Design a protein around this nucleic acid. Structure first.
Ligand SMILES: [Mg+2]
Ligand SMILES: [Mg+2]
Ligand SMILES: [Mg+2]
Length: 150
RNA sequence: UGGAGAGUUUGAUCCUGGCUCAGGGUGAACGCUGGCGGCGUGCCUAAGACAUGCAAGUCGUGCGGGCCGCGGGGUUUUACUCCGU
């Protein structure tokens, strides 16, 4: 009973003596809407196994989202490859203002109000992976004070 | 209190990168259609050319006259038309 949202399906092809030969890739986000999210990229010879595997790997790659009344502790910009995600907390009533990929990811984390920009390469995958890296790097006031003591 | 991206180069991929679109806006124009009202607003081109009317006057308590309507009788009155407004 994580929710699950199917972010990307694509069909890749490779080559053989007299033939194109296909494979599918599914990007699936999985999450409770209460600070936990997962991203997984699954491949298979048919679509539903890809979606299935994606689901599997996502539940197996999850993250501490430190929410705070439906927004995020602080700004972050993550670059992943040539893709870039910028993330900005927002007060309530703002909505989750984002591209389809990072929207999915943030909604299921339980983000209600946030502001975003996809910069750089928009490739849905590297954007997904970077959104995740962004949230993986969020820290709370408490996380920070803990790091600096005496 | 503030920020969404998508399509298209490949057998397929990543990147680069252009083209393209969704939005808002306007002294608008054109097409189909059109019931009311309020407030705004309407030659963006030929600073081309313009019929016609009107758009800058006012003071008689600055001044002297012409003309007229009266009042008041000059020859009684119209011909010499005298004072007052
Ligand atoms: Mg680009
Ligand atoms: Mg080429
Ligand atoms: Mg008509």
């Amino acid at each position: 009973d994580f929710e699950e949202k199917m972010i990307l399906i694509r069909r890749t092809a490779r080559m053989q003596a007299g033939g194109r030969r296909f494979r599918f890739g599914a990007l699936v986000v999985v999450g409770d809407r209460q600070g936990r999210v997962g991203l997984g990229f699954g491949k298979a010879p048919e679509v539903p196994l890809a979606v299935q595997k994606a689901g599997y790997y996502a539940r197996r790659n999850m993250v501490e989202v430190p929410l705070q009344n439906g927004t995020i502790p602080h700004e972050i910009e993550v670059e992943f490859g040539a893709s870039k995600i910028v993330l900005k907390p927002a007060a309530p009533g703002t909505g989750v203002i984002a591209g389809a990929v990072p929207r999915a990811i943030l909604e299921l984390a339980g983000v209600t109000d946030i502001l975003t920009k996809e910069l750089g390469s928009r490739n849905p995958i590297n954007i997904a992976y970077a959104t995740m890296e962004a949230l993986r790097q969020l820290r709370t006031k408490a996380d920070v004070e803990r790091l600096r003591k005496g």
